[PDB]
Design a protein around this ligand. Structure first.
Ligand SMILES: *[C@@H]1O[C@H](CO)[C@@H](O[C@@H]2O[C@H](CO)[C@@H](O)[C@H](O)[C@H]2NC(C)=O)[C@H](O)[C@H]1NC(C)=O
Ligand SMILES: *[C@@H]1O[C@H](CO)[C@@H](O[C@@H]2O[C@H](CO)[C@@H](O)[C@H](O)[C@H]2NC(C)=O)[C@H](O)[C@H]1NC(C)=O
Ligand SMILES: *[C@@H]1O[C@H](CO)[C@@H](O[C@@H]2O[C@H](CO)[C@@H](O)[C@H](O)[C@H]2NC(C)=O)[C@H](O)[C@H]1NC(C)=O
Ligand SMILES: *[C@@H]1O[C@H](CO)[C@@H](O[C@@H]2O[C@H](CO)[C@@H](O)[C@H](O)[C@H]2NC(C)=O)[C@H](O)[C@H]1NC(C)=O
Ligand SMILES: CCCC[C@]1(C2CCCC2)Cc2cc(OCC(=O)O)c(Cl)c(Cl)c2C1=O
Ligand SMILES: CCCC[C@]1(C2CCCC2)Cc2cc(OCC(=O)O)c(Cl)c(Cl)c2C1=O
Ligand SMILES: *[C@@H]1O[C@H](CO)[C@@H](O)[C@H](O)[C@H]1NC(C)=O
Ligand SMILES: *[C@@H]1O[C@H](CO)[C@@H](O)[C@H](O)[C@H]1NC(C)=O
Ligand SMILES: *[C@@H]1O[C@H](CO)[C@@H](O)[C@H](O)[C@H]1NC(C)=O
Ligand SMILES: *[C@@H]1O[C@H](CO)[C@@H](O)[C@H](O)[C@H]1NC(C)=O
Ligand SMILES: [Cl-]
Ligand SMILES: [Cl-]
Ligand SMILES: [Cl-]
Ligand SMILES: [Cl-]
Ligand SMILES: [K+]
Ligand SMILES: [K+]
Lengths: 885, 885
């Protein structure tokens, strides 16, 4: 049946939902707190707050189980247990630091089960085998703690021995460890229902209003008839001198107040639940008393026969003591390779097991408060009911059914933790994620860890030397809550950031359920201590960074450099989806720099102007071509790249250089335009300079390369920016004191001609200029309506530019008519935009047949004649600008 | 002299270190806690713990000043105050959420200064102008708090009026606000030194061991001689009935215990400091008593004439009350545009001002405990010294010097906060980083915020309605500590991550000083409340994300997509430094895929084998060439990219596709080899397939393109991997059950031929194979020594491969001799490495002159004849492999 874990030895190498997931999860959730501490949790805090403590802890594990269901429906559910399932779904660095704190929680749970078994042994079975039976004095805790230290060490030593020499017999005894749990739960239900008509007889002796210990007491009368003569009782001797001394010198409060006997279990049909609703938080050392019991109001001495409060108690202390009961939800995955359909079995079996154990916990809170007297619930170790378990007194056939049933339930839960946690630590020693843990993978002939079992014994001996189960249980509650924190955090983080292999195929999963489970784990950690919560999450964060540094060191070769290569890769893969065209166009530049012979930059002011356009943000790529043969020019291309990078730092350009050696200049330019960047991170716009001296020099190749670049750019659906007289453009230390920036918008590309002066004006050079926008009007439309349609187009974006509509005349808006509509258009622009520091206007497209490339180059010379600084702007076709920054 | 801030109106538009930085910083650090609360902080906690409270708070601001010095030595120190200096050095998202919490700390400081002035008014000047002079009853705090609410509202309303109508007169009164501080400090020093030989006379009336209030008491005798007849005193009437009633019915403790009078200031030359060393933490309501004073031991009633403890006190409550005294260190930067050398003045003036104020605070802790009686220090409001300030009683000329001097010191500090914080909120309304704060930039004719001043009045009225200065002072201590947190955090984070424009030009700056200042700010926040510390750092974190989302929305066009483009840009710029060649070689692939006509992939098993080599990690780029003209083939290149991306997902390749249209196939291949990636994130290795059918088909272009790619690859200093018979390579669902991987290492590229089977073996397909390594031995060396030199070369890296040295014979290690040393070498390989599932061997280089390209292609055909799956490996020249993962 195998409620034990797999771990390694089966990751390198039949069951359904019920016997493969549901019953192994149920066995590991049920345990010692239900039988040894839960009546005391209803005794303190009342029924109403103990119902809230159980409900808060159960909602935390249920949300964590939904995140665990999303992990089991991601990949193919590997055959190694829960550690291999979490590590392959959340990657490394979340497999580690979940596996390490689940390991520490299992190692400290094994100490809590061994201490829980020594308590059922030393109380309730043989209160005679105590080594330190000390003097009858004020130290009743110092001799009890040294009794648990000696017996709990010897119990742990014999239990490491069973894990070593025979673990196959721990496997096949799983069916009777589960049967001891189930018949103990069914005995509590049977004996609570029977108390509606036949309650058991367990009397409690009360002296006035105070609860007396029922040990060392034969009769609760203080009178003690024997045979028609009244010798006073043994209870008389504890509050006076010797038992023949009816004469005098009695204790106060005792001379007053009569001695009565109440029922410890009134049953389900009485109204004792109305007395058990509210809380009884008391400091350590106060007498346990009950309301509706009569008491004078005197003040006597403090006897040794009273039942006192064990420790000081609060709401947050009771949360950390109940919480190890709801853990054990990773048990549904530790038989992963032996399931038929593990993708379907693990969510169904785990979630149903949470609903079963939470019903048993929530219905026991109501049944303890409705059947048991409150002064019996409010003392552990059962001094008021003469040394019985309080939950044992409620069960029908005998209290010995629960005492023997919970002794073997706790002996098997400790044996389960002491095989599981070495098998987990050995599986983290492999995958080589933490290299100094290498020695703890030292498997024997058939799995069987050797040095990992020795380390779990020494850490669990820390939690044996720390005795008192009420102190160990908050320590392992912190480790399990920190384990459930990182699972809930990593599940919601990978679906919000679209981690490449994360796609949970499980309905009723949402990221807001994992975030909600992450918030409850944090709240339960900080109400416990908060300064062990700050330290543990700092230590777990440095473990996250240590595994991430080691993973980057063997993925990229270097640790520190590999952390930037991994961050760049994840961000670039996130962009590879398919809506890349933002409805807010921003120019991402590809700057084309020509090189002359001796390999110097011809026009370095293109880099200055590109730095004023981007202002240190966005993407900028500088592209260049060396004409020649690459097999002979690789050393000349490496030194030419250091020249451009030295020049980019001088002109305050923060970007990338891409240089190529090509046999033709036109071929290397066209390949830079279509292949710069790495997918998503690519250019929007090509920037180049005007070919100055194209007409008068020589052979038609300098100005025909220019037309070929305009054609390649618009075929690629990219934007183009051509700067004319780039040697007259200002440097970075010039700063015009006044001036204009004139935009001549002509029926096309309006969104790009208005964004570009607004972007350029927030640089220091162009800061004090004013934007003027001009349109041309032809007779076959109205001029006034077109103006305020443009004023409203600017006023909602607070660009602050002034608008003029230029009324044109007999004109056209052949070839001699194109050189007549460019002469007329030039004299309108120069009449208004001479002395204007920058002019922006549309450039028209090249002709269809490359026959008219010299008529096109003469068109652009005549149109831009007489202007000092011109930027010709051409849109790519799809540039939607909605928000002007 | 101008101790006021600049803010905006001077960022869009003479002083040295002493008058420009040092004196404005000194004025804003000194204030109300020194004169109104510091004697009570030495009264409680003793001298020794109050010396530690002052030292802890002063070390926090000194480390923050060193981080502030690194900010002032980064850029050019802009002319707008401290907000513009922090925003340009730490970027946005740290300028905001520092400016917002510095704004809230200044707004709540203005309420603390107004409440501090009403206390010096209502006590100590006129205890007659109280509106709610209530009944002489148990409510002495409820009527005092409503007196501060009415006067503090009217004081705030008149003080917003002065900021509005005339602020130039607040500027020019700065020299006399500073003079009131300095002569009050010099009066405390003069009167403490004089008490060594001439102490002042301030008596304290004690009834036994208890401190009596000296108000309403004329004589401290209880006897009251007048003229030879003894009418009992007024002190007799407070502990009895009427003042003529020497008869009977006196109060207990009073009938006993005599009435004595002690000196409130014994002076510096006495030994009163030995009584003031230790702490006096008491709950609210207990009588202030002194040791070494005689008292019977009775138990009387609690009178109204005793001096009681004001509130319950602890160490952490006293840290939050002292801490607003050490703030004000941003004052040294608020005159940034008016300095000659602000880069040198701001570190020198700020750090020296911390040393001056911390000396005054640390030497006042010692002088208060050495000159003042402890029961006078332990009560605020001066009931034991008949209504004087306790620090006023120590000053020489009069107590009225400190009472008037600290009244104007606190009236000017409140006026300074109520002009500074509106000028800060108006400067955050500009830069447009938080768009819903747009209305608070509403400057008047000369700066002068209008709606920002109205918002500072309403938030400071929250801290007036919360009266009791001891409650407001922890609230603004949280905002200033959270301001100093993010400055210390952002300073250490940008120098550890190498933010592009962060280079602090200031010696005695280290990142570990900013991290140390970050740790002290966190500790002082969490010992205060911890649940207002968790909430405030969550709110400040969402403000960081809101500004980062808005900055990415206007830098890239889209908010969510722009966050990945910014993360990729910062990581890629971090790699652009200059040691790119890691001494641990890892293959980063550039996969060359040939396309046939109809634009299908010819050899799709290259993608399968590349996915088995990388196993989902690292960088992989798929490169391809369409032969043709790009102006007609841009639509055929867009559909061919969707075919390859659909195929990459089918073969489990996580990487990038780069496709280019070129006029020649050889030209587009050479440009893909030298220009794929974006700088740092680029390929190490070229992977291509063998040209199957090169001999028998047709014209020599299919196998001459292959030799040209081998030449371009080694000229680029890249590694090469050629796969032969790639159609016989296994798919991703094949998984060999047993087999070998044979490595034939021949005097070259040994580190690459041993890393590649080790990387391939951790994929599921090649998992169950065993690695065999073969070397060849020639006669002119020894064979046994070469074997264990190779065994040791593997055993330290636990590769687990077996080694054989193959003894060769008469051989060579022309052209007919190269085709004879390849026939002999082939028959050794096929004799051992047939039936071997993969063979790896070196390929030799192409010949110098492209004349022997067919002799080279025939050499590689003869050498690899008879083997099913071959990988030919050639190193680039610089591949150092030290750690084998
Ligand atoms: C308290 O009362 C008992 C009962 O009378 C006393 O016991 C008697 O003691 C006297 C002398 O000590 C004997 O002569 C009697 O025989 C005793 N009574 C019985 C019934 O045996 C006892 O001594 C008294 N104690 C005190 C301190 O007075
Ligand atoms: C319990 O103590 C009370 C007194 O403290 C005893 O009560 C008196 O008993 C008589 C008759 O039994 C009543 O009439 C009185 O009213 C009772 N007194 C009070 C104050 O109620 C009573 O005897 C003691 N109990 C026993 C069993 O003896
Ligand atoms: C307490 O003592 C004083 C002093 O003797 C009492 O005052 C006297 O009162 C009587 C009558 O009340 C007068 O005749 C005397 O003349 C008073 N003495 C003086 C000196 O005038 C006072 O009455 C006493 N009080 C009590 C309550 O006894
Ligand atoms: C203070 O109270 C004490 C007693 O509580 C008074 O002291 C007695 O005075 C005489 C002489 O003055 C001494 O011999 C005694 O030793 C004192 N008693 C004690 C207990 O010390 C004393 O008179 C009171 N003070 C004044 C000023 O009257
Ligand atoms: C604030 C982070 C402190 C820890 C640190 C590593 C992480 C493993 C041990 C220390 C330091 C560091 C340096 C980096 O690069 C610095 C450059 O470029 O020189 C990068 Cl990218 C990163 Cl993520 C990191 C880190 O997280
Ligand atoms: C863990 C909390 C995350 C909050 C979130 C923003 C932040 C303000 C609004 C939500 C969400 C988010 C989504 C991303 O991309 C997701 C894709 O690609 O679909 C990226 Cl890159 C980033 Cl940094 C982020 C964020 O920080
Ligand atoms: C008490 O003792 C016996 C009963 O065991 C009885 O015979 C005897 O008479 C009783 N004593 C008195 C005084 O009634
Ligand atoms: C009980 O009686 C004995 C008789 O010797 C006496 O010494 C003792 O003090 C008594 N007990 C009390 C508490 O007085
Ligand atoms: C007290 O009063 C005067 C002093 O003012 C003095 O003459 C008179 O004698 C004194 N009384 C006694 C009893 O000494
Ligand atoms: C004081 O004397 C008056 C005389 O009438 C008396 O009523 C009052 O109770 C006395 N004071 C005390 C506290 O007894
Ligand atoms: Cl349990
Ligand atoms: Cl668990
Ligand atoms: Cl101060
Ligand atoms: Cl400050
Ligand atoms: K459990
Ligand atoms: K201050």
């Amino acid at each position: 049946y195998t409620n034990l874990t797999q771990g390694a030895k089966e990751h390198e190498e039949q069951m359904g939902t019920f016997m493969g997931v549901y019953l192994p999860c149920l066995q590991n959730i049920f345990g010692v707190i239900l039988f040894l501490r839960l009546t005391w949790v209803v005794g303190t805090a009342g029924v109403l707050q103990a119902f809230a403590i159980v409900l808060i802890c159960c909602c935390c594990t249920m949300l964590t189980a939904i995140s665990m269901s999303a992990i089991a429906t991601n990949g193919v559910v590997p055959a190694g247990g829960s550690y291999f399932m979490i590590s392959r779904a959340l990657g490394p660095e979340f497999g580690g630091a979940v596996g390490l704190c689940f390991y520490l929680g299992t190692t400290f749970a094994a100490a809590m089960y061994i201490l829980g078994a020594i308590e059922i042994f030393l109380v309730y079975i043989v209160p005679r085998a105590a080594i330190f039976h000390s003097d009858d004095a004020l130290k009743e805790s110092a001799a009890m703690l040294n009794n648990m230290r000696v017996y709990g060490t010897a119990f742990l030593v014999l239990m490491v021995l069973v894990v070593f020499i025979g673990v196959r017999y721990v496997n096949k005894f799983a069916s009777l460890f589960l049967a001891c749990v189930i018949v103990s739960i069914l005995a509590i239900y049977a004996g609570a229902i029977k108390s509606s008509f036949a309650p058991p007889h367990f009397p409690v002796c009360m002296l006035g209003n105070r609860t007396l210990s029922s040990r060392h007491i034969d009769v609760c009368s203080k009178t003690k008839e024997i045979n028609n003569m009244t010798v006073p009782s043994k209870l008389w001797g504890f509050f006076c001198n010797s038992s023949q001394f009816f004469n005098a010198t009695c204790d106060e409060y005792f001379v007053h107040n009569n001695v009565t006997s109440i029922q410890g279990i009134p049953g389900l049909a009485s109204g004792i639940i109305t007395e058990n609703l509210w809380s009884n938080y008391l400091p350590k050392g106060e007498i346990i008393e009950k309301p509706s019991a009569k008491s004078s109001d005197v003040l006597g001495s403090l006897n040794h026969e009273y039942v006192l409060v064990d420790i000081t108690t609060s709401f947050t202390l009771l949360v950390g003591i109940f919480f190890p009961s709801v853990t054990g939800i990773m048990a549904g995955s530790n038989r992963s390779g032996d399931l038929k359909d593990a993708q379907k079995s693990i969510p169904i079996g785990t979630i149903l097991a949470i609903l079963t154990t939470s019903f048993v916990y929530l219905s026991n809170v109501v049944l303890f408060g409705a059947c048991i007297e409150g002064v019996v619930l409010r003392d552990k170790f059962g001094d008021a009911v003469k040394g019985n378990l309080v939950v044992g007194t409620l069960s029908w056939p005998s209290p010995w059914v629960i005492v023997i049933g919970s002794f073997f339930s706790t002996c098997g839960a400790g044996l389960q933790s002491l095989t599981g946690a070495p098998r987990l630590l050995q599986a983290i020693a492999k995958d080589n994620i933490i290299p100094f843990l290498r020695v703890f993978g030292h498997s024997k002939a058939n799995g069987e860890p050797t040095w990992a079992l020795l380390l779990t014994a020494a850490i669990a001996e820390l939690g044996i030397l720390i005795a008192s189960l009420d102190l160990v249980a908050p320590i392992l509650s912190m480790f399990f809550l920190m384990c459930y924190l990182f699972v809930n955090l990593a599940c919601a983080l990978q679906t919000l950031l679209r981690t490449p292999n994360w796609r949970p195929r499980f309905r009723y999963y949402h990221w807001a359920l994992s975030f909600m489970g992450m918030s409850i784990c944090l709240a339960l950690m900080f109400i416990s201590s908060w300064y062990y919560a700050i330290v543990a999450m700092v230590i777990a964060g440095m473990i996250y960074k240590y595994i991430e540094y080691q993973g980057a060191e063997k993925e990229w070769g270097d640790g520190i450099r590999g952390l930037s290569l991994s961050a760049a890769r994840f961000a670039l893969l996130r962009l590879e989806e398919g809506p890349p065209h933002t409805k807010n166009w921003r120019p991402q530049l590809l700057v084309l720099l020509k090189l002359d012979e001796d390999l110097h930059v011809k026009h370095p002011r293109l880099l200055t102007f590109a730095s004023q356009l981007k202002a240190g943000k966005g993407l900028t790529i500088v592209g260049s071509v060396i004409v020649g043969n690459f097999l002979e020019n690789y050393g000349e291309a490496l030194a030419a790249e250091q020249t451009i990078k030295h020049l980019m730092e001088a002109e305050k350009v923060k970007g990338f250089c891409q240089l190529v050696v090509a046999a033709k200049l036109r071929e290397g330019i066209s390949h830079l335009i279509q292949s710069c960047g790495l997918g998503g991170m690519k250019h929007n716009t090509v920037v180049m300079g005007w070919p100055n001296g194209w007409r008068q020099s020589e052979d038609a190749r300098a100005w025909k390369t220019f037309i070929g670049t305009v054609r390649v750019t618009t075929a690629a659906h990219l934007a183009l920016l051509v700067a004319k007289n780039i040697s007259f453009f200002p440097s970075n230390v010039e700063q015009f004191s006044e001036g204009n920036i004139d935009v001549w918008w002509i029926v096309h590309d309006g969104g790009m001609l208005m964004l570009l002066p607004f972007l350029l004006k927030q640089h220091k050079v162009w800061r004090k200029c004013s934007i003027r926008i001009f349109t041309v009007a032809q007779l076959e439309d109205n001029s006034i309506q077109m103006k305020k349609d443009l004023a409203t187009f600017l006023y909602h974006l607070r660009i602050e530019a002034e608008v003029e509509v230029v009324e044109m005349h007999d004109s056209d808006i052949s070839n001699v008519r194109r050189m007549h509509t460019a002469v007329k258009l030039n004299e309108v622009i120069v009449n208004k935009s001479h002395e204007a520091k920058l002019v922006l206007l549309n450039m028209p497209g090249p002709p269809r047949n490359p026959e008219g490339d010299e008529n096109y180059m003469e068109f652009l010379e005549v149109l831009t004649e007489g202007l000092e600084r011109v930027l010709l702007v051409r849109g790519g076709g799809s540039e939607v600008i909605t928000i002007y920054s």
